[PDB]
Amino acid sequence: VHLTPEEKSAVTALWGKVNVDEVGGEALGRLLVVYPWTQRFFESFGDLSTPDAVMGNPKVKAHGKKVLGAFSDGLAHLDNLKGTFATLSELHCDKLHVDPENFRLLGNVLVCVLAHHFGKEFTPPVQAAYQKVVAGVANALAHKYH
Amino acid sequence: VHLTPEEKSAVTALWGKVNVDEVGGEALGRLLVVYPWTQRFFESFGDLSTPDAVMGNPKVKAHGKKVLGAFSDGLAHLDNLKGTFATLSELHCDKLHVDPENFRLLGNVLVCVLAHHFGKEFTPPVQAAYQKVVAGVANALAHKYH
Amino acid sequence: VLSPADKTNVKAAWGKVGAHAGEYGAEALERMFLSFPTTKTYFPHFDLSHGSAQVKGHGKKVADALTNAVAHVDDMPNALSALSDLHAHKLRVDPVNFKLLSHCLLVTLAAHLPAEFTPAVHASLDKFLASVSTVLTSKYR
Amino acid sequence: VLSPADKTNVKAAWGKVGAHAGEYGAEALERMFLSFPTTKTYFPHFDLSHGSAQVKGHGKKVADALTNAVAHVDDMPNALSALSDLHAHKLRVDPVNFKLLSHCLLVTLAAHLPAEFTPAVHASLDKFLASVSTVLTSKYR
Ligand code: HEM
Ligand code: HEM
Ligand code: HNI
Ligand code: HNI
Ligand SMILES: O=P(O)(O)O[C@H]1[C@H](OP(=O)(O)O)[C@@H](OP(=O)(O)O)[C@H](OP(=O)(O)O)[C@@H](OP(=O)(O)O)[C@H]1OP(=O)(O)O
């Protein structure tokens, strides 16, 4: 997408303070709690039956870290989110069959999680720049579906 | 948008049999009857109380014919929908204040009215060519909102 | 709310679909998979090519389920209670896809009911498909 | 539908919004116009500059309707009836916009209630803003 660079360095400063190991697991955790029909791709992960299980479940924390490490790769290729994500886009389509509307739902839980985590420091204009990145990644990752 | 050179001959061959003036009025009509909050833009228009009041109003008819005349130009340039409508985008934005979500709703009422009209000729691959065209014209017209 | 005009208009257009519902179900499915191809990540296990007996057999179940909801228009949350439990707990199809099937069902009826698909039956049909989606989505959480 | 434990979570969390309800309602609004600028086609006659008194006065009408819907959470259509009638017969705001304000509302609360915005209270508040939005758009057609 293009961010004005007042947007670009908004996103980039904030993200240098993130814990990708812990916002990882909370974002993918709260997706599986707040939108429970998304647990259909993760039953192999165990006990996902209360909120406190989902959040305690270490495969959930582990793969969140892996979701959020790839996320950080495109925050570094913001110019080119499509070539950077063409491969996982193909992979979520063709080997994982993930409905790309879930990419929008993780998008918006990640913005709730960054508000949570940065408090007042996640101002209306940093959110607005971060709604433009998570639509960009959701888009980039829907990219190779057919 | 990306219409394969087969999706564009499909769109172009159905649209040269279309009477613009009459499909125009049945699409605005059916927008106004099937999604009745869109009538918040057309108070100056008169009797809009029942389906046949909306469908016989000659104001509603008339402006349908004005909308579809400009969509019809959009079709002569599928390769630059954004500069061919950015002047109506800028006008529905700043002077008419239409939420661009009404351009999805009219786009999906016009796929229903060309089906209704063509019947068994409006095939599943001709529906799929026109879904990408009324999406491209909705993005085009949403382009200069802000 | 489905008004009493709506129920008559939906029982009038669906009655005229008739012994052809099964057929019209499959053609909707097909139109959905070609126009909104993310809707295909839900059928990975299907033969989704044209005339597939799997698409024509899923067409017949979607279509029977609509016949039963038109027949108990008056009591949908109860006629459709096993399929809202199935949808909500095994299928867990994202709610947006309900919009994309109802649109390809509305274009299949228009295509085959020239004379019956009037502005007002269309509003009635679009209202009823939106209550059936709301009821199959009710117990998602 | 709001389970009892959802009712308890909604009421606890709106419990400490308490008297900043108005100020967070103005700030959800202000995130909404900046994150989703199409929603401003609805506020033509406002000043939507940072710190406008009209954004702050409409945040307070809005959070007070939510306060009222929290206190009458077991009968929100009678508690919100006249607000459904104004959305439906005058404001006539496209239904997707409720979804955009709920998410700004949840990002504002998330940011001001570090301790009370738990997965669980996040899930009940999002079920609760999807129920107030269903009730305000009830009667659109
Ligand atoms: C911002 C969007 C996302 C990013 C960048 C992302 C990234 C990734 C990565 C890097 C992997 C692993 C690739 C490998 O192991 O070779 C993966 C796997 C997976 N992703 Fe995603 N993903 C995203 C969203 C989603 C969503 C929202 C869903 C489902 C609701 C999803 C479902 C899966 C599943 C099912 C797997 C495999 C889990 C397993 O291997 O057992 N992803 N994703
Ligand atoms: C494919 C979608 C659309 C196209 C091509 C289109 C085109 C037009 C045209 C060319 C005009 C007249 C502008 C002028 O006078 O120079 C117009 C006016 C207008 N349009 Fe649209 N339009 C579309 C969708 C919509 C929708 C969905 C609505 C809202 C329901 C809307 C609301 C209006 C209104 C209220 C006017 C003002 C009538 C007047 O000035 O007399 N338009 N539109
Ligand atoms: C895009 C996905 C999707 C949508 C929107 C959708 C919308 C609908 C609607 C819409 C108003 C109805 C009435 C309906 C009816 C049904 N669906 Ni749906 N289904 C969908 C994807 C499925 C899938 C997948 C299954 C499993 C089919 C199978 O046999 O595996 C399914 C199964 C069913 C069944 C059969 C289950 C059984 O074996 O008993 C019925 C009946 N449905 N589905
Ligand atoms: C993006 C558009 C938009 C959204 C989503 C929206 C969503 C909501 C939500 C849903 C959770 C609530 C509780 C809510 C509450 C209210 N809105 Ni909303 N409103 C919106 C645009 C308006 C507008 C426009 C008005 C009239 C305001 C004015 O001052 O003219 C309005 C008026 C009101 C009033 C004022 C009543 C009055 O003046 O008599 C209340 C209360 N609301 N609005
Ligand atoms: O990735 P996007 O920001 O959506 O932009 C690209 C494309 O340019 P790039 O592929 O170089 O990014 C064009 O964007 P504009 O320069 O016109 O703004 C436009 O493609 P068309 O020329 O075919 O219209 C289309 O943007 P959109 O669909 O948002 O209008 C989109 O192309 P793709 O969707 O094919 O990637």
Please tell me the distance from the alpha carbon of residue D11 to that of residue C128, in angstroms, as a whole number.
Answer: 34
Between the alpha carbon of residue C133 and those of residues A18, B110, C77, C94, D2, the distances in Å are: 39, 22, 11, 11, 19
C47: left (phi over 0), alpha (psi -120 to 50) or beta: beta
Please tell me the distance from the alpha carbon of residue B34 to that of residue B37, in angstroms, as a whole number.
Answer: 9
- CATH no. for A1-146: 1.10.490.10
Please tell me the distance from the alpha carbon of residue A123 to that of residue D60, in angstroms, as a whole number.
Answer: 20
Long-range contacts of C115-119 (CB under 8 A, 24+ apart): C116/C12, C116/C13, C116/C16, C117/B116, C117/C13, C118/B51, C119/B29, C119/B30, C119/B33, C119/B34, C119/B51, C119/B54, C119/B55
Q: What residue type is A31 in one-letter code? A: L
User: Tokens for D77?
Assistant: 């259509």
**CB under 8 Å to A22, separation ≥6 — which residues?**
none
Residues B93/D41, Cβ–Cβ less than 8 Å: yes
- Cα torsion D43, D45, D49, D50: sign: negative
- B47 CA to middle of ligand 4, Å? 27
CA terminus-to-terminus distance, chain A:
22
Among C100, C97, C68, residue whose Cα is nearest residue C81: C68
Crossing angle between the packed helical segments B81-90 and B124-142, to the nearest 10 degrees:
50
DSSP string, chain C: ---HHHHHHHHHHHHHHGGGHHHHHHHHHHHHHHH-TTGGGG-TTS--STT-HHHHHHHHHHHHHHHHHHHTTTSHHHHTHHHHHHIIIII---THHHHHHHHHHHHHHHHH-TTT--HHHHHHHHHHHHHHHHHHHTT--
Between the alpha carbon of residue A131 and those of residues A82, D28, D100, the distances in Å are: 17, 14, 11
Please tell me the distance from the alpha carbon of residue A17 to that of residue A23, in angstroms, as a whole number.
Answer: 11
User: Tokens for B59?
Assistant: 């104001």
Among B78, B86, B112, residue whose Cα is nearest residue B7: B78
Q: What residue type is D76 in one-letter code? A: M
CB half-sphere exposure, A102, CA atoms < 13 A: 28
Residues of chain A found within 8 Å of residue D27, distances taken between Cβ atoms: 124
The structure was resolved to a resolution in Å of: 2.6
Tally helices (H) and strands (E) across chain B: 7, 0
Pick the atom of ligand 1 nearest to A44's CA: 41
Between the alpha carbon of residue C80 and those of residues A32, A71, C137, the distances in Å are: 26, 40, 11
Instruction: Show the DSSP H helices in chain A as ranges.
Output: 5-16, 20-34, 51-56, 58-75, 81-94, 101-118, 124-142
The full set of domain ranges for chain B reads 1-146
CB half-sphere exposure, A120, CA atoms < 13 A: 1
| CB-neighbour burial class of residue A43 (10 A; exposed 0-12, middle 13-18, buried 19+) | exposed
Mutation test residue for ligand 2: of B66, B68, B71, B82, the one with most atoms within 8 Å of CB: B66
Residue of chain A minimizing CA distance to C92: A37
Per-residue HEC secondary structure of B51-98 comes to HHHHHHCHHHHHHHHHHHHHHHHHHHHCCCHHHHHHHHHHHHHHHHCC
Among B6, B12, B39, residue whose Cα is nearest residue B105: B39
The answer to whether B98 contacts chain D (CB < 8 Å) is yes
The answer to whether B53 contacts chain C (CB < 8 Å) is no
Instruction: Show the DSSP H helices in D19-94 as ranges.
Output: 21-35, 53-71, 76-79, 81-86
The answer to whether C42 contacts chain A (CB < 8 Å) is yes
Considering only the beta carbons, identify the residue of A111, A112, A131 that sits closest to D122: A112
Q: Which residues of D91-130 are buried (b: 16+ CB within 10 A; e: fewer)?
A: ebbbeebbebbbbbbbbbbbbbbeebbbbbbbbbbbbbbe
Considering only the beta carbons, identify the residue of C31, C114, C126 that sits closest to B34: C126
CA terminus-to-terminus distance, chain D:
22
Pick the atom of ligand 4 nearest to D57's CA: 29
**CB under 8 Å to D95, separation ≥6 — which residues?**
D133, D137, D140
Residues A46/A54, Cβ–Cβ less than 8 Å: no
Chains A, B in contact, 3 or more Cβ pairs below 8 Å: no
SS3 category, D46: coil
Nearest-CA residue for ligand 4 atom 16 is D62
Pick the atom of ligand 5 nearest to B139's CA: 30
Q: Does D58 belong to an annotated binding site?
A: yes
**CB under 8 Å to B91, separation ≥6 — which residues?**
none
Residues A14/A126, Cβ–Cβ less than 8 Å: yes
Domains contained in chain D, CATH given? 1-141 (1.10.490.10)
